[PDB]
């Protein structure tokens, strides 16, 4: 099988910057059967460039493709916000058809502090003997961020589940959700519940708390 | 427009069988090559199977890992393509896209999720998350299996300021959350409701967010 390698897997770029993504084959691939797909999370991959250099319908003119034999590349002339996505190269010159690992393309923007919101357990979940405290850390940049939970001042790390969104296409920010799950008994045994976020935008953490009283 | 409706996904125990169907519309089905592609977090994008048009052999082609287990077929009279899968493995878990190719142009469906596991299907519990020019509300979708669930707000008309987070698996149960940010004059003045669909359990739950 022809194996395609897209290195690096992740790449950051400035607005207006000329970006280039590479795709390397282990053997020769006919240029007619080398294509590129774009994918944004929660949506299917879309044909972006076909036969090495031909833009699909809807793709803006700042995109281009190039290469031959064993080395191909996709190039964006002026990076824009809507261009932040995953890009896969694909070959069907020799079967089986194979994809590259893909390259995550992220755009840079002015640092932004997270909007933090904390939510106590709902009465419905309590009726079932569980208690989840939720913390949303929305619309921040860069993606590097830390969150920690405190129960009555004591740091907690068990029962914590985190989840991160990919870069937003309109404002280029990131978001995060943290859920601390306890038993109803454990939850009723304490008072202060705290979610604090450490981000590159402040020396002191952003703190959101609530008391069961 | 081109439309490819996939079905047949869901939960299956290891070693079992399942058939995926894809009903096509919006183009001359007999002219197009029909393919199945798979996507998973661990294995990435994988071409699974292909069947060409009658004009050039009607020849099927398969990926190495699925040879002898997967069977691809097409019914031009029904504009449908099918993928029969026998003796399924954990590695077969993923999102399966039906695609169609005419000339160099190709089209992908939204996909259907196939999960190979011995765990049991369980419906989600939907909990409201209620608490200054903006206010943030949310829904916690906990304890469901398998993937996926779909989340909208006010039946899709409230799309701005929404963050639906990827699911997290623990103890064979998935949990995700969704947040929405609205002007403070609009809530609780106007209603805010999250809609959670879990097709594997044939469940849909609407939760109106009301203050505490």
Numbering used by the authors:
A (entry chain L): 0 to 212
B (entry chain H): 1 to 131, 138 to 218
What do the authors say?
Polyethylene glycol (PEG) is a water-soluble, low immunogenic and biocompatible polymer formed by repeating units of ethylene glycol. In this regard, we have developed monoclonal antibodies that can bind specifically to PEG for universal detection and quantification of PEGylated drugs by anti-PEG sandwich enzyme-linked immunosorbent assay (ELISA). In this study, we determined the crystal structures of two PEG-specific Fab and one nonspecific Fab in complex with PEG. Both specific Fab/PEG complexes share a similar dimeric binding mode that is very different from that of the nonspecific complex.
The monoclinic crystal of 3.3-Fab/PEG complex contains four Fab fragments in an asymmetric unit. Each Fab comprises the N-terminal VH and CH1 domains of the heavy chain (named H, I, J, K) and the VL and CL domains of the light chain (L, M, N, O). The asymmetric unit can be divided into two pairs of Fab (H/L, I/M and J/N, K/O) related by a non-crystallographic two-fold symmetry. In either pair of the Fab an S-shaped PEG molecule was found at the pseudo-dyad. It binds to the N-terminal side of the Fab, which corresponds to the complementarity determining regions (CDRs), in a symmetrical way. In fact, although the 3.3-Fab/PEG complex crystal did not contain crown ether, some PEG fragments were bound to the side chains of K19(H) in a crown ether-like manner. On each 3.3 Fab molecule, about 605 Å2 (or 3%) of the 19,600 Å2 surface area was buried by the PEG-mediated dimer formation. The heavy chain contributes 445 Å2 surface area, with at least 10 amino acid residues involved, and the light chain contributes 160 Å2, involving at least 6 residues. In fact, the subsequent AUC experiments demonstrated that 3.3-Fab exists as a monomer with a size of about 48 kDa in PEG-free solution but forms a dimer of about 90 kDa in the presence of PEG. Therefore, the observed 3.3-Fab/PEG-550-MME complex was probably made up by two 3.3-Fab bound to a single molecule of PEG-550-MME.
